[PDB]
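User: Need the bound-state model for magnesium ion:
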Amino acid sequence: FEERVVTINRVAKVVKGGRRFRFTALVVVGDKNGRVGFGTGKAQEVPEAIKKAVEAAKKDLVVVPRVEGTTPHTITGRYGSGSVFMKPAAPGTGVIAGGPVRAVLELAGITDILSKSLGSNTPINMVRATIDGLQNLKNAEDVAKLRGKTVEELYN
RNA sequence: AUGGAGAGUUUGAUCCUGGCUCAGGAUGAACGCUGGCGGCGUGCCUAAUACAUGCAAGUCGAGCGAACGGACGAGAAG
Ligand SMILES: [Mg+2]
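Assistant: Bound-state model below.
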């Protein structure tokens, strides 16, 4: 499992004297073979925050249906104000994505896709929107089984 | 299918909303520094402001009369 630190953020809680600072780490973990997850970790130092985030991400993983390195179909993943449009591309296109979306897609193993963040650019909600889209993706075989037909009947 | 990336900035910290700003491409460009060559293009966007000077619409003698011109070659011998 490869892991990428998306963002590290120094948050503060106010106390009677001064402030208590902590580090929050958002991390994406993936095998580059259709499995991806994300996690957050809070600690007094960034290495420990990253370690906790990685453990949480490994706890939470999703399976991404793929077709030769790209998604089966266009999808818009939404979470809160996050919103990420994603569209299958052709080989050699590359991953046309910005910010946390690229982390999520590359670690999921997608190498050719087009995307656009249409909503909030706050990294955690961007990641959640991307994961929501990948979760709602569908594959031809599963939809054929659900609709009680064959792939050939599906495509006519 | 030939095709679509985002970032900074409101808070002690947060999410949202929201504007501002930046990274790209372009030009009949101008300016600053600098500047070797070749090829192909482009070059008063302003004052439809005023313009010295030269040139940018002539040609036809196989339409016509006239004028100039004077070969080829006549005559006298100074
Ligand atoms: Mg949680």
